[PDB]
CSV table of C-alpha atoms and ligand atoms in Angstrom, one decimal:
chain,number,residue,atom,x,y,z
A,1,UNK,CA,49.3,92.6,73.2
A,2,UNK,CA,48.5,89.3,75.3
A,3,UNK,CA,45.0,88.2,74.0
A,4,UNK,CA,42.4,90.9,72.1
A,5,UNK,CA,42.1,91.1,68.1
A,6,UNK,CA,43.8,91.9,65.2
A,7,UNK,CA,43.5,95.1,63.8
A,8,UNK,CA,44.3,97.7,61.3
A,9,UNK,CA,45.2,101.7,62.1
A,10,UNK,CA,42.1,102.8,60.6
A,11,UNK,CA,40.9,101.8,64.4
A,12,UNK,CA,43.5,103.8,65.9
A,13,UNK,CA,44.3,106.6,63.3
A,14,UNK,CA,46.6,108.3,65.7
A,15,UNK,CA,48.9,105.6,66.9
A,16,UNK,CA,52.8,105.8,65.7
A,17,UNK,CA,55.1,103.1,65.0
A,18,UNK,CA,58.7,104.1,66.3
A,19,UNK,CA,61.7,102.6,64.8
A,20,UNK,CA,65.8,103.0,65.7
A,21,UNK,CA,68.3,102.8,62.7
A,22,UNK,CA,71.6,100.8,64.0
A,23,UNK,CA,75.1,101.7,62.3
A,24,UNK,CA,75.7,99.0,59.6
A,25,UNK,CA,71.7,100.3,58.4
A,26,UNK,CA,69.6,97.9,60.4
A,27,UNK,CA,66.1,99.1,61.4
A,28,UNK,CA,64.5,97.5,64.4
A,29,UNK,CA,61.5,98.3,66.6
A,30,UNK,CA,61.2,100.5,69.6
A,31,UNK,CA,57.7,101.7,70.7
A,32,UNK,CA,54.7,103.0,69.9
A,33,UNK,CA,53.2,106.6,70.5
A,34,UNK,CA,50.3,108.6,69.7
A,35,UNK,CA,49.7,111.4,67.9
A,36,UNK,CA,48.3,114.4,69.6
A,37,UNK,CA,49.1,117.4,66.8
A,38,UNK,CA,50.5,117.5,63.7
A,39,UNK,CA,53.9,117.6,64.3
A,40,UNK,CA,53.8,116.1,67.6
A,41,UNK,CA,54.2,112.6,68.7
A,42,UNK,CA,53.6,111.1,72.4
A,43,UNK,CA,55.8,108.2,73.8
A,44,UNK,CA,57.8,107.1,76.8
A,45,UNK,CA,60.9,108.1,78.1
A,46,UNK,CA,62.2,104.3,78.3
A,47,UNK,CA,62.0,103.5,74.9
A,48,UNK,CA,64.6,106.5,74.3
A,49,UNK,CA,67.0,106.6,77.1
A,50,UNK,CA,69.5,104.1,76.1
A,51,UNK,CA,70.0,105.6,72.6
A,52,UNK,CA,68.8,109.6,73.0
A,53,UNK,CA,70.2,110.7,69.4
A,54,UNK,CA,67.2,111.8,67.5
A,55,UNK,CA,68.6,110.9,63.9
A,56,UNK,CA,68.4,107.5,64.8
A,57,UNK,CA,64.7,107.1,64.8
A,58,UNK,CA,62.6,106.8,62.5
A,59,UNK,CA,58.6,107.2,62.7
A,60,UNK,CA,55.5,106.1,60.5
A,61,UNK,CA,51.8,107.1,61.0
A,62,UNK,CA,49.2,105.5,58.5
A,63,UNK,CA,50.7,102.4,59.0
A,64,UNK,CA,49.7,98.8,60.3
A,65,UNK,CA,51.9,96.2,60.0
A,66,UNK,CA,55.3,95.4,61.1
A,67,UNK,CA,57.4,94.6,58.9
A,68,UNK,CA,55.7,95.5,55.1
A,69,UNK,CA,54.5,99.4,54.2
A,70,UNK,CA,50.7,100.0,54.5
A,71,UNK,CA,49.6,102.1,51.4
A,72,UNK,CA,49.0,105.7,52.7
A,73,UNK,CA,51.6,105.7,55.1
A,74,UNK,CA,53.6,108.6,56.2
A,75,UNK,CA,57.6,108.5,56.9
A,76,UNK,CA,58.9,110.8,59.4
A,77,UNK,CA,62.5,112.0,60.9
A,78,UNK,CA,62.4,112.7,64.4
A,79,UNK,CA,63.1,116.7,64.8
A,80,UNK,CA,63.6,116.7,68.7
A,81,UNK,CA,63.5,113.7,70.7
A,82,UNK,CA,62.0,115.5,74.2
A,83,UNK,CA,62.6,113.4,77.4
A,84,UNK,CA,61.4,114.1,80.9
A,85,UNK,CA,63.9,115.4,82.8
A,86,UNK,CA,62.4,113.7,86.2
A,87,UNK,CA,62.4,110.1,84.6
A,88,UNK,CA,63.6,107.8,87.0
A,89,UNK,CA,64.4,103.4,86.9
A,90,UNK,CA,63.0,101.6,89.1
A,91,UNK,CA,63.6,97.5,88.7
A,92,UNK,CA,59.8,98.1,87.0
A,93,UNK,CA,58.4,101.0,87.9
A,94,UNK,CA,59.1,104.0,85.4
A,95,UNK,CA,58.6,107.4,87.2
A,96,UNK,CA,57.7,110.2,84.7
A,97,UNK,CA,57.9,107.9,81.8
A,98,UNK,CA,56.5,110.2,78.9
A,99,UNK,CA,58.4,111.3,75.8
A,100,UNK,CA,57.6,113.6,72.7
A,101,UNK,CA,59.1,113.2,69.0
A,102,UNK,CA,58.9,116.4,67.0
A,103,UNK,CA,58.3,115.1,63.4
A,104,UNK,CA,59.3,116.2,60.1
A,105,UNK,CA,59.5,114.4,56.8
A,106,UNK,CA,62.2,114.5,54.3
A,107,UNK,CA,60.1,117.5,52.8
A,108,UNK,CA,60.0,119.2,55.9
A,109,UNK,CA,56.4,119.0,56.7
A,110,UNK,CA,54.2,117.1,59.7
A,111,UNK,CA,51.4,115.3,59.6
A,112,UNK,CA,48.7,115.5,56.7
A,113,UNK,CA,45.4,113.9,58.2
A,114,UNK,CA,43.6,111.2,56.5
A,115,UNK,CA,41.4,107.9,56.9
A,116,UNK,CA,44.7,106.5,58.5
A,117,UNK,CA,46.1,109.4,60.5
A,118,UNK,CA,44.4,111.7,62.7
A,119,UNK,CA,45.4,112.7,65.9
A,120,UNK,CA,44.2,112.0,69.6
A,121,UNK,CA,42.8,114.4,72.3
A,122,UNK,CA,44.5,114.8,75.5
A,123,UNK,CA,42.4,114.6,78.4
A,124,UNK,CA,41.7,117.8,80.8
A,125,UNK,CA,43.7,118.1,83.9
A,126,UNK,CA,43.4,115.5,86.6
A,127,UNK,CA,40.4,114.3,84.7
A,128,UNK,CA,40.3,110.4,84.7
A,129,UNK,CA,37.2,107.6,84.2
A,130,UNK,CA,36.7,105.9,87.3
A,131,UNK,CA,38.0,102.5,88.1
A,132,UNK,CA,36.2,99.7,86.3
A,133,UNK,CA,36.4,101.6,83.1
A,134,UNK,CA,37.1,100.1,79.6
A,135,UNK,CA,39.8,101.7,77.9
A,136,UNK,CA,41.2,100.1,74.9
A,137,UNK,CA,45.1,99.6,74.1
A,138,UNK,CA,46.9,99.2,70.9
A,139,UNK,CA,50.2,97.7,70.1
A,140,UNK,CA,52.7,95.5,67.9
A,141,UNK,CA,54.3,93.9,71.2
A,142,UNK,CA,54.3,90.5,72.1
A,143,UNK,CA,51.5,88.1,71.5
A,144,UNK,CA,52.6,85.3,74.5
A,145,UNK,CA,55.2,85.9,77.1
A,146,UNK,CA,57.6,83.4,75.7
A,147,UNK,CA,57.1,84.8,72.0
A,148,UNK,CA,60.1,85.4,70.1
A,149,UNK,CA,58.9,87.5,67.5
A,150,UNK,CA,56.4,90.0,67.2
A,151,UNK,CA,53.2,90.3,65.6
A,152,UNK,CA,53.2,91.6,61.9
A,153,UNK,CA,49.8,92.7,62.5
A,154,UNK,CA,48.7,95.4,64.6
A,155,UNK,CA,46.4,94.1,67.9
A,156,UNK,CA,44.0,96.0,70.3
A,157,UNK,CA,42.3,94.5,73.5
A,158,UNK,CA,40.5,96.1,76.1
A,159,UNK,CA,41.5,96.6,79.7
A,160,UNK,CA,40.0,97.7,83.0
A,161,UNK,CA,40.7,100.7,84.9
A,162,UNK,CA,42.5,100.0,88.3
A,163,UNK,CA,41.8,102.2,91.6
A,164,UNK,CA,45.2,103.5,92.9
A,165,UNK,CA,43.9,101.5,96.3
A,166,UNK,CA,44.1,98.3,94.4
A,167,UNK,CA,47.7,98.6,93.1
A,168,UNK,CA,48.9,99.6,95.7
A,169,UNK,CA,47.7,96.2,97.9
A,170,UNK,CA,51.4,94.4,98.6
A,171,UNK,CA,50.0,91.4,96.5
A,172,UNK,CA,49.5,93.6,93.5
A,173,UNK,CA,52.3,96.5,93.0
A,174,UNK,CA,52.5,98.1,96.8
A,175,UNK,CA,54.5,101.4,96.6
A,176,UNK,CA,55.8,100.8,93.1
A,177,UNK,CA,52.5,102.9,92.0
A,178,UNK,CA,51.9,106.1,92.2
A,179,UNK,CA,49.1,108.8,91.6
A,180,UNK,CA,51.1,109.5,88.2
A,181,UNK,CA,50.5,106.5,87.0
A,182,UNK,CA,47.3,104.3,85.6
A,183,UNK,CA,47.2,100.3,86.8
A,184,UNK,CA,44.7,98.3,84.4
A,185,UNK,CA,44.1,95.0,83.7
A,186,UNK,CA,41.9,92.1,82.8
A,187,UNK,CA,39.2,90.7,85.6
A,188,UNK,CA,40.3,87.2,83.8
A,189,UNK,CA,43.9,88.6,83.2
A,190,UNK,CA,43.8,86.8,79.7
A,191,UNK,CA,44.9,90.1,77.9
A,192,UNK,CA,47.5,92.6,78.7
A,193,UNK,CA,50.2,94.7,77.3
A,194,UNK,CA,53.9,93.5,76.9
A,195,UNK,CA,57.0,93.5,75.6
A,196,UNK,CA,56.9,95.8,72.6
A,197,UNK,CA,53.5,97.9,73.6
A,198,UNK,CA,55.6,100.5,75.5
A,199,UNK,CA,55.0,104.4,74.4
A,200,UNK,CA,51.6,103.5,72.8
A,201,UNK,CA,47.9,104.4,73.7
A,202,UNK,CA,45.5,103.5,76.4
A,203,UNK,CA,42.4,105.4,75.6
A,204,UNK,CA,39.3,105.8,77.0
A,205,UNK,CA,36.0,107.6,76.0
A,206,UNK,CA,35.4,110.2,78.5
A,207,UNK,CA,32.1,112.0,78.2
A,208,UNK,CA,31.6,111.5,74.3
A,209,UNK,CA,35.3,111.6,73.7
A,210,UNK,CA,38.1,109.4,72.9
A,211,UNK,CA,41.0,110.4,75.0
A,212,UNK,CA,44.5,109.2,76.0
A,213,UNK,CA,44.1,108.5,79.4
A,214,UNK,CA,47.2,106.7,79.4
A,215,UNK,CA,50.7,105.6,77.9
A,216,UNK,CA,51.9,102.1,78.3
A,217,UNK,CA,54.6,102.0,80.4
A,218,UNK,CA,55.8,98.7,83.0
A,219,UNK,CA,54.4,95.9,84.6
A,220,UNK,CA,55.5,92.4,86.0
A,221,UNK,CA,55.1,89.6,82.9
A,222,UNK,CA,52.2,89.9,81.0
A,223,UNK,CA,48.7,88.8,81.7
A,224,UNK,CA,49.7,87.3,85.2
A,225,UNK,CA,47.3,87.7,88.2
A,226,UNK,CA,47.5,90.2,90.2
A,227,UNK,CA,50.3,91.7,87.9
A,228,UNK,CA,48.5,94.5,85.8
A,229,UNK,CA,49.6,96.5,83.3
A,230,UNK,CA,51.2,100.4,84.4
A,231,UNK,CA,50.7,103.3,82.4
A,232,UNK,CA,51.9,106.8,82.5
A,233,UNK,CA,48.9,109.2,83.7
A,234,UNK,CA,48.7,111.7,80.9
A,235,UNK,CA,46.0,114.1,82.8
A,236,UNK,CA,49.0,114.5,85.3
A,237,UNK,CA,51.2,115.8,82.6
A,238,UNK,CA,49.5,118.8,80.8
A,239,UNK,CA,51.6,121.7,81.9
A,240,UNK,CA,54.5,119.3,81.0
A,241,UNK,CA,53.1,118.8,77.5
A,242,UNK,CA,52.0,122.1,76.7
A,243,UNK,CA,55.4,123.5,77.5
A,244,UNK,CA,57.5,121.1,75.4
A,245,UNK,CA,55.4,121.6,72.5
A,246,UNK,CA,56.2,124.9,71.8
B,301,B25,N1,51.6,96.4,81.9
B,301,B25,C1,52.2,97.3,81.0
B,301,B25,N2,51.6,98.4,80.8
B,301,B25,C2,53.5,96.9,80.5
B,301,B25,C3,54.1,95.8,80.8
B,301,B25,C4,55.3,95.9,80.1
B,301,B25,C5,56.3,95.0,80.0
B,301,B25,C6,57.5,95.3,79.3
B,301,B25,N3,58.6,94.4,79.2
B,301,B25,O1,58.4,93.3,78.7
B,301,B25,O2,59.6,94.7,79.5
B,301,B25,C7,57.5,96.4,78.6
B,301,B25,C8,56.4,97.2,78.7
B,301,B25,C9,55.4,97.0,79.4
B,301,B25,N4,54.3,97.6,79.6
């Protein structure tokens, strides 16, 4: 996250920190995700497709920094790793970037809700705020462009909701966009997602609700003009979801 705050997962209970064991016992980053039932984490495809063995990821919920445990967490092995069949790479643009982690501890169970973990609602079919909206995402990528490392401290920042009709202009995204996917930036575009943020939350409140309108997905740079942040379209992706989760 380009810009926003610091924060702790107590201000997004749901969100899941994704990790890849490498042989010789290094673990390393991915993604985030989001928790939408117990046993059942949200992602994208991308973060998966170069290494699609589920026994090589690791998950946490409860958790909110980087690099050190956050007391309460919860450890988890990844039971299926679920990728869309459809996905397609573009030089940027993702098609049908979503992903689902089944999780299961050591212990065999999912997750136990808490003050750190709870899970987030999916939105109802084709059933978005309209463009202007502030949606809120959350992330442990990149704090400037150029950054080497990543924050160990979880950030959130707030974003504006993108009509499809403004992406698509030639001097934003053209074509790249589609109507599965979310554009949403900054009016100043001083904060953003990047590198690191993929697979985690964009959620908005829709009619008293929170909601995850969205999963971070592509964009060109980070917090450039004219360059906002893509996200996959979850209220396009229900029958999708439901099915896989079962
Ligand atoms: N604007 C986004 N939603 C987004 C940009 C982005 C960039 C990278 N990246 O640095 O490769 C990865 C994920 C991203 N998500």
């Amino acid at each position: 996250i380009i810009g926003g705050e610091f924060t702790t997962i107590e201000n997004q209970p749901w969100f899941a920190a994704i990790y890849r064991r490498h042989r010789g016992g290094s673990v390393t980053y991915v993604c985030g995700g989001s928790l939408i039932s117990p046993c059942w984490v949200i992602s994208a495809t991308h973060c998966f497709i170069d290494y699609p063995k589920k026994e090589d990821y690791i998950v946490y919920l409860g958790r909110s920094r980087l690099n050190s445990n956050t007391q309460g967490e919860m450890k988890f092995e990844v039971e299926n790793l679920i990728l869309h069949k459809d996905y397609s790479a573009d030089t940027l643009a993702h098609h049908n970037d979503i992903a689902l982690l089944k999780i299961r501890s050591k212990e065999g169970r999912c997750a136990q809700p808490s003050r750190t973990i709870q899970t987030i609602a999916l939105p109802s079919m084709y059933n978005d705020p309209q463009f202007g909206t502030s949606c809120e995402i959350t992330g442990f990528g990149k704090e400037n462009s150029t950054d080497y490392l990543y924050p160990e401290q979880l950030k959130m920042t707030v974003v504006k909701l993108i009509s499809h009709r403004e992406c698509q202009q030639p001097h934003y995204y053209g074509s790249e966009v589609t109507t599965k996917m979310l554009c949403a930036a900054d009016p100043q575009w001083k904060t953003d997602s990047c590198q690191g943020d993929s697979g985690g939350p964009l959620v908005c409140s829709l009619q008293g609700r929170m909601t995850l309108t969205g999963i971070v997905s592509w964009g060109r740079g980070c917090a450039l003009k004219d360059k906002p942040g893509v996200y996959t379209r979850v209220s396009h992706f229900l029958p999708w979801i439901r099915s896989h989760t079962k």
